[PDB]
UniProtKB/TrEMBL annotation, chain A:
<dbReference type="GO" id="GO:0005743">
    <property type="term" value="C:mitochondrial inner membrane"/>
</dbReference>
<keyword id="KW-0813">Transport</keyword>
<keyword id="KW-0249">Electron transport</keyword>
<keyword id="KW-0472">Membrane</keyword>
<dbReference type="GO" id="GO:0016491">
    <property type="term" value="F:oxidoreductase activity"/>
</dbReference>
From TrEMBL, chain D:
<keyword id="KW-0812">Transmembrane</keyword>
<feature type="transmembrane region" description="Helical">
    <location>
        <begin position="65"/>
        <end position="83"/>
    </location>
</feature>
<keyword id="KW-1133">Transmembrane helix</keyword>
<keyword id="KW-0830">Ubiquinone</keyword>
<keyword id="KW-0472">Membrane</keyword>
From TrEMBL, chain E:
<protein>
    <submittedName>
        <fullName>NUSM subunit of mitochondrial NADH:ubiquinone oxidoreductase (Complex I)</fullName>
    </submittedName>
</protein>
From TrEMBL, chain F:
<feature type="domain" description="NADH dehydrogenase subunit 5 C-terminal">
    <location>
        <begin position="425"/>
        <end position="624"/>
    </location>
</feature>
<feature type="transmembrane region" description="Helical">
    <location>
        <begin position="453"/>
        <end position="473"/>
    </location>
</feature>
<keyword id="KW-0812">Transmembrane</keyword>
<keyword id="KW-0813">Transport</keyword>
<feature type="transmembrane region" description="Helical">
    <location>
        <begin position="509"/>
        <end position="536"/>
    </location>
</feature>
Amino acid sequence: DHVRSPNVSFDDIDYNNSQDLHNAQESLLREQWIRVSALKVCRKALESCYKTSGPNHYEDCREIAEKYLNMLPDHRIQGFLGYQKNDPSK
Amino acid sequence: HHIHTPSYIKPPTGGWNFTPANWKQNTVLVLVGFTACCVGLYKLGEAGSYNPKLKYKEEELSRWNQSAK
Amino acid sequence: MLVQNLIIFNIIGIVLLVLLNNNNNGILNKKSLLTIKNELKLKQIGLIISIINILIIIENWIGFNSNYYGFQNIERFLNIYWGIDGISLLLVLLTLILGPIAILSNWKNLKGYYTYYVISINMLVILMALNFICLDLVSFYILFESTLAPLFLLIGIYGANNKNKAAYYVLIYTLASSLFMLLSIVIYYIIINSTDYIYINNIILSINLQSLLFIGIIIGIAVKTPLMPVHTWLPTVHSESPLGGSILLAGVILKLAIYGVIRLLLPNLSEISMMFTPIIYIISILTLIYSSLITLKQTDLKVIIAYSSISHLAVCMIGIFANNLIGINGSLILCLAHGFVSPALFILVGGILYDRYHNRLINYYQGLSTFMPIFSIYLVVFSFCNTGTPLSGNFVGEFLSITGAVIRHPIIGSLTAASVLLSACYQMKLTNRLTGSVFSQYLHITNDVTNREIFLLNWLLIPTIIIGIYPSFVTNILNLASSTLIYSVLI
Amino acid sequence: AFNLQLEKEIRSKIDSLPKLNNVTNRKLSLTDYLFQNAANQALYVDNEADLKELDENENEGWEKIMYVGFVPTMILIFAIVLFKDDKSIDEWAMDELLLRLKEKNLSDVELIDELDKLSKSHVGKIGASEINKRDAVIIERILNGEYDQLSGLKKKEL
Amino acid sequence: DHHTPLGPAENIFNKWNVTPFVWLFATVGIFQWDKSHRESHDGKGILDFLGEIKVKESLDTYFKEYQTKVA
Amino acid sequence: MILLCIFTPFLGSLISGFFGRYIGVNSSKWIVCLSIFVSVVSTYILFIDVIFNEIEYTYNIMNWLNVEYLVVDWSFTIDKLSVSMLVPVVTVSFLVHLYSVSYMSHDPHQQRFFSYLSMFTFAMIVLVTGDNYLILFVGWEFIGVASYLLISFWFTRFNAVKSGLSALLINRFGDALLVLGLSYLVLVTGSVNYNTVFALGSYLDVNMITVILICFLVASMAKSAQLGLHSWLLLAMEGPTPVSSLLHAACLVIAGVFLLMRSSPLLEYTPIVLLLILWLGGLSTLISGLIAMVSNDIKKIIALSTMSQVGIMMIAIGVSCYNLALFHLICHSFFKALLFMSAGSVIHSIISEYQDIRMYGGFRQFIPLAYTCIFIASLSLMAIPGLTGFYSKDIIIESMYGEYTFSGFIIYWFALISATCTSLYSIRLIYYTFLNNPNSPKYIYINLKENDIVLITPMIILTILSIFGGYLLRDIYLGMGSPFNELFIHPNNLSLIETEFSLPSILKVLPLITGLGGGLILLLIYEFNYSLFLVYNNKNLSKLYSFFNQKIMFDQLLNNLILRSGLNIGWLLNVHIDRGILQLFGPLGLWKLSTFISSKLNKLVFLNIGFILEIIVLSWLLIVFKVSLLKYILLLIIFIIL
Ligand SMILES: CCCCCCCCCCCCCCCCCC(=O)OC[C@H](COP(=O)(O)OCCN)OC(=O)CCCCCCCCCCCCCCCCC
Ligand SMILES: CCCCCCCCCCCC(=O)OC[C@H](COP(=O)(O)OCC[N+](C)(C)C)OC(=O)CCCCCCCCCCC
Ligand SMILES: CCCCCCCCCCCC(=O)OC[C@H](COP(=O)(O)OCC[N+](C)(C)C)OC(=O)CCCCCCCCCCC
Ligand SMILES: CCCCCCCCCCCC(=O)OC[C@H](COP(=O)(O)OCC[N+](C)(C)C)OC(=O)CCCCCCCCCCC
Ligand SMILES: CCCCCCCCCCCC(=O)OC[C@H](COP(=O)(O)OCC[N+](C)(C)C)OC(=O)CCCCCCCCCCC
């Protein structure tokens, strides 16, 4: 039916086991589309708030717009090759 | 008047003052079709249209910011 | 069993068309039923087979999952692994559809040897289709150069006056360049001991060895898709090649290079792609600007469209090398959109006008809307589609590619917007001239568009509009697959 | 309908008026194109050719193939894209966010009440659209905080 | 007077005008057929019979079998 | 009632386009007029609900783009600003359609003219009803496609086929920048929806805001025929008069101003763009009013009149008084549409069908109805108090001095010159065609009559709206404190109070005093003292006349120096690159090198024992030499090839 995301961080696996490495790539992707969807819902509130408030949209939608701009830069598909082929700890 | 060779040139619009012999017969045949289409647009239009300022009341929005604050 | 069915069926079909025709050579004069009506009973078999190949992919389409990550329908045939993912599904689907239209385009404008022509078209279509469903660099190369053998002979046998000049150009430009890709494919086979996609996607190479591999592969790509300054072969080939060859060449073959970027560069040379991306933009944007100014000062009818295809293939490369889903998805949609509008233009220019008046000089023709109104209607519509009109599929590809470039590089990527203005100049100047002023005094009044020629245009126009109005038929499939190519670390 | 005796009638008419340029009952079958003897195959060429030599681009042989083979194929492509029960990845994510919202707020009755009223065709349409539905609580919960474990998939910092 | 005569009588329901509407009418009915068929079969569309999307569990086996051979 | 207002013209446009052959000519014109009439009624119903009862409509059809965060839907919202654009467009277009039934009665192609004419109306309706910037772009492009067909309608006329291409290409230059601006909207904000984007105006950086709106401004310059991109405006007269009666009143011309008005939430927080908008208007108003006074064509003068009157809407935007510009846009759609139709009836009435105003004279008694429509329109165009022009045009000029800035003061004189020039060339046009001694052959006058009732009905309807409409609709837009949040005016930019209170009495009458005095002074000189206006005597006055008559030479500078130069760059690439170095470094160059080398080699293959003996002995030197000297032998071996 609705198959879930097999949460597997790259740091737990050895890339030699190809079946595991596939899981860590798929899991990182499926957690990135959820963030984009949560961006759409957040922006779906900003549109409704802006219209209903009218002239008040600078105060009745202040936090919603502020959160949307804060989350915009990093709520987009980034891919797994960025974190698979890099180790941030070094 | 003159000859414009409309014998073989048969565009979708006729061209060079073209009017078919049975133009009255097809005239209502389109009014019947066109009027039905507009009725479809009025039935589709009213069913699906909405007011974007009334879908969400003011109380619901006044709490959304408190969640995202 | 897709590939196993696909190769075996065509191999069976090729033998069937070989047996029926070449049985009557013998010592006897060719009094035969099969060749009656210009080999009508041997053309129809060839047209049926190209339609059937479309039914083979559809059988495997209904099982395709749009949500599972990785290659699907993984099969081992001829000791080669064949797989289909989101990107390979639409390019195979597009390739097979252009099969029947390539055959049907040359249905009654050949002087002879229709059996040879039919088999050559099918072999080009199948080999192109098989090229998107391989799973190693070596097998990618084999189906990337096997097309030269039928393509070199098709142009020479069924060409225009300068076919000798063009037959060399297609054979040598695509071999003296793709060989530089063989070196880079071989280097992978030496240091990794396998060319399989999934095996080499996970291996990082030194900073220098990625550059040496990128150059060797970009050389074989910058030639296959005409990119300045090695673009000087396609306009000659398009002018001389037959209508079936021109449809397949700019419809599928030039899109192999866009797909070649997806398989050979982005995943396994991911770091060096970011280093080369500013270089690609300078090369691509100047290709867009020059190939649209050059088109202004052209004279030949089919050459004019040839340079038009180059500009809309520079937009694809700009979009695909963007490091975001917006650029990558639009680049792929534009390839699909350009897979129908570009073949359609060659039918109007080199398949209807040339097949009646037998000339390709833009000076003769003007005011064709006076006695060829149906030809003008499809001339104007396919002209506005080719320029990036919003209701067409070109716009969706051209908007997302331009927007995708701006996200990657907002400064130089802004120049990608020149495609919006430049594509309007050279294109409408052709459409304005061909449908303007009094009917030309050099052309006698002849038959208007026939049923066969109308059919091709209607079935090359509808997919373009459908993608333009509602591209979610295409975007939804690609969204998972296109998200894998992106390389970025955000902290 | 090969009718060899009728076939010689056509060639006879050619011989009746040998000069040139100064059919309704004609057909064949698939089995005729293969096993007919050279005597018959030789003659049918003559009758067919000089009938043409007497003289608007119709009956070219492609009509019964493209309209029967190719056109239904494109309809099938049209049918598949529109009516395939496939979740796109973005659509799958939209469903998943609600499911992860349902589990993490089992103490929130109003969210659970509204989720059950969100039909299969109302899942990804959360917004001020034509559809008449109550989803204000759903939007509020999503604005409250994140509902993903992405930071749990990256175990290393700078 | 201009005295321009009328042209030949035309059939507005000719072969080239009816077909576009037939494609339009066919799609709407099939769309409405599919709209109902989902509720009466729990969200499964009219193409339920021709096949179904393959599951992830089945496909991962082919990938694992194929990734062992390549290694 | 929303979906009926938008797509009805599209249905009417298609009926004549494809079924037109089967439904004749006369029965095909009235069906197209029928489809527009439905839309006119539906707009007023919406206008009643939207402006007065504050109800908004939105019909979301289906999604269009779903690429990650970027979502764009085929939706069409109808809010207050949208309806205030539907009133000029849909109402005039019906009158243009009603006018065109009897104007184009003699044209052999009538089933095709009304197919594009209504398609134009639908293309504009989509523009002013899209609820995201991309749907606006779908409409924005299709004004050009519809205009390209209509301007080049008579495709057998060379000056008209070329004129369509000029109108299509210059707009694409504007559309090239609009696409770039749309991209920066997706980059900075992530969406192109009006709701999402406008809600962020106060939180986005100025430079990012400036970059987008500069692109919108360049896009608008092409459509509103402002300075630097106004060559296409006058070249568009090659189309039929109804085309000019529709494009230059409530259509393609005005579409630049609407885009800038829609972007008021973004435009406010960038003072630098509002300065550029203000200065384009002042120059375009000043220049057009000067060119119009020495032009000698009835349609060129009116065409130049629109460019001056559109520029007045630009300066009203530059002072953040968006309400004034929108109101003057609605008014101008009626006393400028009426001018074209009446002028299109003067040309039709005369049997020689001249268009030069120097072949007219003494027509007032012969065609008094067409004169009366022009005279009422001309006074309204001159902003005479009491008429629609006064309630809209004067207040914009009032506020040029009402901002009390240096830039505001300079543009005030440019407006004031154009306010007077509007009063000067308007009198010139009427005097040259209605109060002058006859120039045409006497045979024309004994056949110079009026037209039928169908051609007369629209002009009377527009004539009434050119008197009363400005007064009735003033308080909706220009009222004090009227709620019009669809157009954002920042609190620091509300200078409407100072404009209506701090202007001395002299300014409130100055445009009229110079307009009435200047017109009468010119009227006497034209009548009793015409010897002065033969400009061939004073070489300074001959050079001046020949300068503005050629439209500031901008047509000559654009054609001879940019298009001619631009085409030459394409020739240089074709010669020195495409057929040049890339052919020397290609098949032609490599044929020479191969022929050179293969010529040297074929000499070596010749049966000789002594020849093959020396090379065998020569190769023994490879063993002797230290292998550090291989590169030198390689260099020498190449030398011997030569
Ligand atoms: C030139 C030759 C003629 C051939 C080409 C003619 C032009 C093509 C016209 C049709 C274009 C094909 C697109 C129609 C197919 C319907 C697309 C669709 O799937 O709609 C999706 C919509 C929302 O998606 P979802 O919630 O996921 O539900 C679908 C699940 N199966 O689900 C729905 O609710 C269905 C909504 C159907 C809406 C009716 C379709 C309206 C199409 C006309 C308006 C196009 C948009 C407006 C553009 C006009 C110019 C501004
Ligand atoms: C929002 C998007 C809406 C799109 C739908 C618009 C419906 C209108 C279609 C009517 C077609 C028509 O009339 O073309 C057919 C007519 C026929 O000739 P005629 O002019 O009647 O004169 C007839 C006398 N001849 C024979 C001397 C011409 O013209 C032509 O062959 C003129 C050539 C240019 C046609 C350009 C068509 C562009 C279509 C739209 C491109 C996007
Ligand atoms: C997809 C996998 C395909 C694999 C099988 C390929 C079979 C090839 C045909 C063999 C039979 C044959 O040579 O026959 C010749 C056939 C048919 O000639 P015809 O015009 O009917 O002869 C009629 C003669 N009259 C007129 C006198 C009666 O023409 C061909 O040469 C076309 C196909 C091959 C062209 C290019 C070959 C080079 C291939 C290089 C590596 C790909
Ligand atoms: C009342 C409800 C509305 C009525 C209108 C419905 C009309 C349906 C079609 C009937 C007429 C017909 O099929 O014309 C099709 C025409 C005419 O060519 P033909 O048909 O081959 O005839 C000529 C051949 N002859 C001589 C053998 C008879 O082809 C075309 O070039 C169509 C060009 C398409 C232009 C628009 C493209 C879409 C872009 C915009 C997307 C939004
Ligand atoms: C690194 C980037 C790689 C790009 C692709 C390679 C360059 C393109 C060359 C195509 C030439 C062609 O096609 O040869 C065609 C040409 C000439 O043409 P023709 O038919 O005689 O017409 C001309 C007729 N005249 C001259 C009588 C008027 O023949 C030759 O000169 C044959 C020798 C070709 C040498 C190929 C060397 C390749 C080296 C590549 C590595 C640097």
